[PDB]
Amino acid sequence: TTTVGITLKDAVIMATERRVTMENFIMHKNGKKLFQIDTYTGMTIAGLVGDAQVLVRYMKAELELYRLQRRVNMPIEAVATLLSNMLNQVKYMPYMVQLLVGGIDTAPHVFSIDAAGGSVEDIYASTGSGSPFVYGVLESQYSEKMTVDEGVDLVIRAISAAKQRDSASGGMIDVAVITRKDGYVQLPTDQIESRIRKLGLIL
Amino acid sequence: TTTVGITLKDAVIMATERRVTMENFIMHKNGKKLFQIDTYTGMTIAGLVGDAQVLVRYMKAELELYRLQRRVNMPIEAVATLLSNMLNQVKYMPYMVQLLVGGIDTAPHVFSIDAAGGSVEDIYASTGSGSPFVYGVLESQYSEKMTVDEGVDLVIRAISAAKQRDSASGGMIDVAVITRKDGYVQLPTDQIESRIRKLGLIL
Amino acid sequence: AYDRAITVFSPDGRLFQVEYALEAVKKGSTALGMKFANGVLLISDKKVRSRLIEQNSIEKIQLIDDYVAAVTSGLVADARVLVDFARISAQQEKVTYGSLVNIENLVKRVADQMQQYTQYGGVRPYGVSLIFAGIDQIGPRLFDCDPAGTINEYKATAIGSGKDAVVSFLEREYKENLPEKEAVTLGIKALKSSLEEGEELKAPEIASITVGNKYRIYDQEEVKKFL
Amino acid sequence: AYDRAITVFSPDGRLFQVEYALEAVKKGSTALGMKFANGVLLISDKKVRSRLIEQNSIEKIQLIDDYVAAVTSGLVADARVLVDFARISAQQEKVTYGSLVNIENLVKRVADQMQQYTQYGGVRPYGVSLIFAGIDQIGPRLFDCDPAGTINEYKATAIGSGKDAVVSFLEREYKENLPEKEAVTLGIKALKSSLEEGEELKAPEIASITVGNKYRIYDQEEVKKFL
Amino acid sequence: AYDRAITVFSPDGRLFQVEYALEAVKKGSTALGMKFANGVLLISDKKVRSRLIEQNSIEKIQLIDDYVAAVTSGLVADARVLVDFARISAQQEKVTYGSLVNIENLVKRVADQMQQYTQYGGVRPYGVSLIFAGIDQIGPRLFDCDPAGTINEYKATAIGSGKDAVVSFLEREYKENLPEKEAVTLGIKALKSSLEEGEELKAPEIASITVGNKYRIYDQEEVKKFL
Amino acid sequence: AYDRAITVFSPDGRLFQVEYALEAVKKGSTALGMKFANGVLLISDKKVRSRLIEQNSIEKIQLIDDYVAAVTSGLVADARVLVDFARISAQQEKVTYGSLVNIENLVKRVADQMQQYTQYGGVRPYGVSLIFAGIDQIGPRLFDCDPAGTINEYKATAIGSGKDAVVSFLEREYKENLPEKEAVTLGIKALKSSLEEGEELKAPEIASITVGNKYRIYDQEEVKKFL
Amino acid sequence: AYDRAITVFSPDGRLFQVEYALEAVKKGSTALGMKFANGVLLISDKKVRSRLIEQNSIEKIQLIDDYVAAVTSGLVADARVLVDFARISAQQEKVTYGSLVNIENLVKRVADQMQQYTQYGGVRPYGVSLIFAGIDQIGPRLFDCDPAGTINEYKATAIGSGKDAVVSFLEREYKENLPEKEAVTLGIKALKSSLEEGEELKAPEIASITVGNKYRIYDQEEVKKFL
Amino acid sequence: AYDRAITVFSPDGRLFQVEYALEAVKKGSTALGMKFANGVLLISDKKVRSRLIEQNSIEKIQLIDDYVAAVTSGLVADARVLVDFARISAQQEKVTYGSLVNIENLVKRVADQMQQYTQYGGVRPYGVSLIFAGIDQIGPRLFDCDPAGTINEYKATAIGSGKDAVVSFLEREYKENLPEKEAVTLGIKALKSSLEEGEELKAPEIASITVGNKYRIYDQEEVKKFL
Amino acid sequence: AYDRAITVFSPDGRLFQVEYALEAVKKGSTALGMKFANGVLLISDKKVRSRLIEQNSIEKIQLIDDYVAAVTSGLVADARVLVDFARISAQQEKVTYGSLVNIENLVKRVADQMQQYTQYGGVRPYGVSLIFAGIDQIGPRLFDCDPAGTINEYKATAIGSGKDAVVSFLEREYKENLPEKEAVTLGIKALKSSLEEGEELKAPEIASITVGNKYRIYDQEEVKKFL
C-alpha cells in the first residue's frame, strides 16, 4: 500500500498505487487509495479498508458543510487537527489506519497522521509497506528547486522502485497534482504510461 | 461455499452451489445461498448461516421500503455503501460473513464486501473456500467480448472444477441472470442439467 | 377562546394556532421559482435596505448543497434555524447513502421537523415557509414546505405576501420547457404584477441550475438586464 | 365548558374533543372501496386542482406494500404521518414473521397508535380516517380506522364528506362477488350520488388487486371509460 | 365545579369523574351471564346493523383463552384495548405458573390496570365494564369489573343499559344448578324483560362452557330456537 | 376556594382535601375490635346484600398473615390496594428479618405510604381507614391507620359511620382482660348501640386470635349465638 | 390573591404560605425546655386523652439517640416523618464520623430538609416545629427548628400555642446554672402561666440529661411531685 | 397582572418578581464595609434581642475561609443556604487550584447560582444580598451580590434597610487608605446616620483583615470603644 | 391577552413577549462601533456613577479573545451570562479547529443559544443585545445579535436607547476606509447626536483593533482628546 506526497514551490504532488490484498492472496487488482476531500485538498488512505473509507466519508461531508456555511475553505492545519481529535477520542478502541493530508491555502503543506492522532508536518512523507524503499529513493534525488514535471517523474520512479521489492504493492499509478491556479488535477492514464515509457520502466 | 459473479456487456451472471456443512459432517445437501433483494439486484451470502440470513432479511426490507417511498430503485453503489455502514458499526462484535452484491442501474456492477466493511468494485469476484479454484479458472478463460450463453457455460465450468478439489462444496448449481430487458431471471434445473450434459461433466 | 393552544380543535375542527403561523408567513417578501427545460430557477424580491449591511447576509436564497437550494419567508430567526437543519439533514443523507439521491427525503426531514411542533403543547410552530429546488437522480425538482409540514411538488410557485397574485399569474401564463432566459423574464413579470401601485421593482436575487451543472447566482448586473 | 381537554368526560359521558376529530375528518373529499370476487378495489374522488401540481403527490390512495394499500381523508399533515407509520409497521411485521401474513395487525398497530392520543393530556388526536384494503393469507380484506382507533372489517364503505350518502347507497344496492368491472361501475355510481346538484364528477383515482396478483392503478384513460 | 378533575373530592366525598365513566358504560347494549350445574354461560344483546359489516368483528363476547372469555359494554376503543390486555395478562400468568390456575388474578390484573387511571391527573379512566367467565382449578367463575376497578364474583349478572332490569329479574327468578338449556332460556327471558315496549328481541350471541370442555359459541340457528 | 388542592393551607392552617378523605371514610360500615386476656378480636358490621354475591369476597376482615389481620372502611378500590400493600410489606419484613417480629413496622409501611400522597400535587389521598390487629413478640396489638397516615395503638376502637358512638360506648364500658366470649358480647353491644332506630343488627363477621395460636374466623352460626 | 403558591412574593415581600405553616404550628400543645448546670431538660404539656390509647405512643418527647432527643408541635403526620428523618440522619452522621460529634449538624440536616420544601412548587412545607436538646463534645445544646428551616441555639424556649407566654415568663425569670430540680420547677411554673383561666395543669412528660449520662424520662409519679 | 411569574416581562420590560425579592432584601438590618490601607473591614448593625439566644448564632458576619468573609441581609433561611454554598464553593476552588487565588470567582459561583433562579418557572429567587470581603493574590476585595446575581466590586458599600443613607454618606465622606481605626470610626458614623430619630446605636459586630494576616472579630469591648 | 406566553402567536402573527425583550434592551445605554481601513472599533457611552465602584467592572466592552470583543445593552445579569457563554464558545471553537478561524460561528453559537429560549414555554428570553467585532482569517467583522437571535453583519451600527438616532446619523454620514482617528471622531459625533438637550457627553470607553495586531483599550486621557 505504497503512498507518497512531496511539496515543491507552490505545488503538491501526491501519488499512490492500486492493489488490495489481505492474505498472501491478491483479491483485487484495481482499488481506490487517492481521494479528493475539498477544492484544494487531497488525502491518501493506507491500512484497513473499512475504517479508511468511513474516515473518507466523514471528512468529505464535514469539509463540505464547513465550506457551505462559511464561504471559505478550511485551512490544512485545521483539517489535520480535526482529524487528529477524531482519531484520538477513540484511542483505546482504535482505527487501524495511517493517512496523509496535503493541500494549498497560502503555502503547500503535507501532514502525516498516525493511528493514535499525532500529526507532524514534514516536507515529504510516505506511508505503507513500501515506505522504506520510497524514503530510500527520495533521500538521494529530492531537491527543492525541482519543477513540476521533474516531481511527477520522481514520484513515478520512487513507486516503480518500491513495486519491485515489495510483494504487497503493484498495479497502475494514480498521480494527482494540486496547484493554486488550476486546482486539484488528476493526471490521465495515457500520460502516466507515456512517462513510464520515456523513463524506461515496465508495466 | 463456492460463489461467483461475472459481468458482461449489459448482463450480470451470478452462480452458487448448495451444501451446508459445519463439521467434517454434511448436514444438508440442499440449501439456499442466492437471493433476490430488489427488482434488478441479487446477493450471494457465504460464511455463517444465521448472520447471513439476518443480513438478507434486513436488506430486503429496507430496499423494499426505499423503493416504495421513492418510486425509483436504489443504485448499486448506494446498496454497497449502506451495507458497509451496517457491517462496520459493529466491527468489534462482528458478523462472520463475506458477501457479493450485483445488479444493473445503467451499467453492470459487482461489489465484494468483507466482514469489516470494505467494498471494492471489480469485474469478476468469488468468495468461499473454492474461491482460489474459481479464480484459477477465470484467470485463463474470461474475456470481455463473451456472450450470455458463453458466460453461463463459463460459471458452470468454474464451479464444477471447484467441486472436484474442495471437500466443503457440492450439489446442484443455482444460476441467475440479470438483464435490463428481462429482469432477474433464474435458470431452470433441466436447463442447467442440459448445459452440464452438453459440456461433458457429471452430477 | 380556542386560539390559545396548539393542541385544541375548534368545533368546526380547525387549528387556529397553525393558521396564525400561516398569517406570520404572509408578512415576508415575495419569492418565486419554477422549473424549465433541464433545470429550475428561483427569484426572490428584496426591498433594498441600509448600505451598512453586508449583502452576503440578506440573501433569502441559500445554497444547502451544490445541487439543492432554497428560499424562505416569515420569521427571520426560525428561517435561519430551518435552513441550518436542511443543511445538516442533507449532510446526513449524503453520508448514509453516498450522495443526495433524492431531494424529496431532505424535504421530508424538514417537513416532519416542522410538523412535530404543531402537535405538542409547550412548543410553538415555525412561522416560515420554504421553497426547495434542485437537481437529483430524477431531474428538476420544486417543492414548498408550509408551517404545518405539508409538502407538495410543483412546476411553479411563490411564497410570501404576494403569493396569491404570483400563483394567479403563473396559473394563467406559465408554459413549460422555456429556455432559461425566457423563463426568467416570465418570472420577473410574475414578480412585477404582485406589487402595489407606485412601487417600482428593485433588483431581485435570481439563481438557477441546469442538468449536469452546479448552481450559479446571477450577479446584480446580469439581474439588471431584465429590469 | 368540557370540549377543551381530551381527558374529560361530559355528564352524559362523551368525549367532545374525540368527536371534533370526527368533525375534522368530515372536511375531506369522499373515498370509497369494496371487495368482490377474488379481490378488493378503492375509489377516491379528487376535485382537480392547479395544473402546476405534479400529479404523483395528490393521490389519496397510497401503496403501503405490493399487497396492502390505503386511502385517507382529513388533515393532510396527519394523513401523511399516518401512511408513513403504516409503511414502517408493515416492514416490521414482514421482517419479524417473514411476510405480511395478516393485514389485521398492521391495521391494529395503526389503530393503537391513533387510540393512544385520545387518552393523554398534552397531545391532540389525529384528524384522519384511513381505509385499508389488500390480499393476505385469508383473502380480500377491507377495514376503516377512525380517529378514536376503532377498526371494523367491512365488505363496502366510504369516508369523507359524502360517507353517509355513499354507505346509504351501498347499503341498498351492493351485491357481492361482482366481476371487477361491474363492481367499479357500481362504486362510480355510489360516488356520483354523494355530490351536490350542479357538480359534475371529475376523474377519480381507482385501483384494484386480485388474488395472486399485485396492485395496479387504473390510469386516467382507463378511468375515463366509466364517466 | 368539581366534576372536572379525576383527582378531586366533592365535600360529600364523591368522585364525579369516576361516576361519569359509569354513565358512559350505561350507553352500551345489555349483556348477561350466569353459572349453572358444571359451567357458566354468557348472553349478549345485539341490535343488528348494516349487512356490509363482517359478523366476526361485532361480537361483544370474545375468547381470551380456551378456558376464559369475556364481554364488554361502553366505549368501543377502550373495550378493545381492555380485552387485548386481558389476553396478554392471561398469557403471562400461563407462562409464569404453567397454566391459567385461577381466573381471579387475571381479573385482578385487569382490575388494577383499570383502577390506576382513577387516581392520577392527566389520564382519564376507561369507560368500559367487563364480565369474565370460565373454568379454573376451582370450577365455574363469574366476575364483573367496573370502571373504578371494583370486582365482585357473582352467580348471575348483567351490564349495559338494561343491567338494573335484568339483575332485578334474576334477583327474583334465578335458581342455581339448572341444566344448560333451561339456564339459557331463563337468561333469554331476563334479556327480554329489559327492552322497551315495541322492541322485538333480535338474535343474541350466546356461548357456554362445561367442566372438562372448552368453549363453543352457539351459532345463529341454535340461537334461533329460543326466540 | 382552598379545598381544591392537596398542597395548600387555609389561613387557619387546615388541609381541607385531607379532611374530605375523612368524610369519604365516614360512608363505610362500622367495624370494631379490641384486645383482651391473651389476644385481640375484630368485629365488622355487614348489611347483607344480594345472594348472588359469593360471600368469600365481601369480607371486610382480611388475613394479611397467619398472625396479622385487618379490616377497612371507605372506598372499596383503595381499600383493596391497601390490603394488598399490607400483605406485600408483611412478606418483605418477614424475609429481611426471618419473621414478622413487630406488627408496628408493618403498620408503619402502610402509614408512610398513605401519608406520602397527602403532600404532593397531582395525587389524591386514599379514602380508607384500616384497623390492624394480631400477635407479635410483644403480644396483642391493635392499631388504626387513617387517611393522613396517623397511627395510634389502642386497647379498643372502631372505624366507619358509627365510630363516634362505638368509641363513646367503649370509653365508658370497656374493662380489660375479659375472657374471649364476654369480650365478644361487649363488642356486639357496642356495635348495636351505633345503629339508628328500627334497624336490626344482622350477622357480623367476627374473628379472633390468642397468644400461641393462629387466627380463626367464627362461622355464621357461632356468630348467630350472640344475636 | 398571593397566599396560594409557595413560590410567590407579596409586594411587601412576604411568603404567606410559609406563614400559614406558622399558623399550623400554633395549634399544637405547649412544649418547653432549657439547659442548666451540666445538662438540659424538656417539658411537654399533654391534655390527657382516652384511656384506650397506649401511653407509649402519645409522647411528644422522643429519643433520637441515647444522647440527643426532641419534641414537636403541629401536624402529627409531618411530626412523625420529621422525627424519623432526625433518627436516620443521626445514624448517618454517627457512621461517617464514628460518633455524633455535634448536635448542630443533625439539626442542620433536618433544617435543610424542611427549608427545601419552602422554595419549590408542587410541594407544601412541613407544619411542625421541633426542639432539639442533648449532650455533645461541647456540652448542653438546645435548638428550635421552625417550618421555614430557621434554627437558633437558645438557653430556654417553648413551642406550640403557649410559646409567647412561656418565652415571656422565661425572658424575665430564668437564671442559668440551676440544679436540676429547681430548673424543672421553674419550667413547670412557666408551663402553668401559659394556660387559660380555669384550666388545671395535668401531668406533663418531663425528661433530662446530665454531662456524662444518658437520658431518663421522669415517670408519672416523679412528675407528680411538682404539681 | 404580571407580578405573578418569574418568567414574564412587563410591557416596559421589567421583572416585578425579581424586584419583589429586592423589596424582601430591604427588610433586613443595615450592614456596611470598606477597604483601607492594606485591608478591608465589615460592620453589621444588630438590634439586640433576647438574652436566651446564644450570641454565636446571630452573627450576620460569617467566616467562609480564613481569608474570605461575608455578611447578609434578607430572609434568614435563604441567607443560611447562601453562606453554606459560599463555603462549599470556596473549598472546591481551593482544591482544584491549590488555594483560593481570586475572591472574584467565589463571588461568581454564588452569583450564577443566585441568577439561575430568576429565569426558570417553578422556582422563586433568593431574597438575600451578600457583601464579600477579603484578601487574595491581588489584595483587598469588596463585592456585593444582589438577588438577580449582579456583582460589582466597590471601595465602600452597605446593604439592608439603611443602604441608601449609608452609601449617601460614604459617597460624600469616604477617603481611601485610612489607618484601620479611623476607617472603623468613619464607618460607625455612617451606620449612625442611617437610623431613625430616637434610636440609639447598640453594639455592632465589626471585623477586619490586613495584608498578610487572618481575620479577627473585634469582641464587644473593643467594639464598645467607638460608641 | 396574548402577551403572557412566549409560545403564542397573535392573530396578526406577532410574538409580543419577544418584542417586550426588545423593549427591555431599549433601557440600556448607547454603544456603537464600525469597521475602517484595516480594522474595527467600538464606542460605549457611560453615564459616570459612584466613585466607590472599581472601574474595571463597569466596562460594557469586554474582551472575549485577544482577537474578538463585544459590548452589551439591557439586563445586566443576562448580559454577564451571555458574555461568559461567548468566551466559552470561543474556547471550544479554538480547541476543535486550532484557532478562532471565523468570528461568524462564535456569533452563531451565541445566536442559537439566544434563539432557543424564544420558543419553549417555562423559559423567558434574554433581554440583551450584543455587538461583536474583531479580526479573523477574512478581516474586520462587525455583527449585532438581538434577543430573538437574529444576526446581521454590518459596516456600522449601534444598540441601546440611542440606536435609532446613531444609525440614522451613520446612515447619512459614514464613509468607509477612514484612518482610525477620523473614524473615532465620526463615531463620537454619532454618539453626541443621540443624547437629549442639556446632557453633556461624559468620557466613553473606546477600543480598537487593526489587521495583524491585538486589541487595545484607549485609556481615559486618550479618550479625553476627542471630547
Author numbering:
A (entry chain J), B (entry chain K): 1 to 203
C (entry chain R), D (entry chain S), E (entry chain T), F (entry chain U), G (entry chain O), H (entry chain P), ...: 7 to 233
Quote from the publication.
Unfolded substrates enter the chamber through a narrow pore in the center of α-rings, where N-termini of α-subunits form a gate to impede unregulated access to the proteolytic chamber. We designed and assembled in vitro various asymmetric archaea 20S, in which one of the two α-rings contains a point mutation, K66A, which prevents RP binding to the α-ring. Our studies reveal that, upon binding of a RP with a conserved C-terminal HbYX motif to one α-ring, the gate of the opposite α-ring opens allosterically, resulting in similar proteolytic activities of 20S singly capped and doubly capped with PAN.
Because of the symmetry mismatch between the heptameric α-ring and hexameric PAN ATPase, PAN does not engage with α-ring symmetrically, and not every binding pocket in the CP is occupied by a C-terminus of PAN. To obtain sufficient resolution to evaluate the gate conformation, we applied a C7 symmetry. Even so, the conformation of the gate in the C7 symmetrized density map still represents the state of the gate. Whether without or with the substrate, the proximal gates are in an open conformation, consistent with the gate opening by the C-termini of PAN with its native C-terminal HbYX motif.
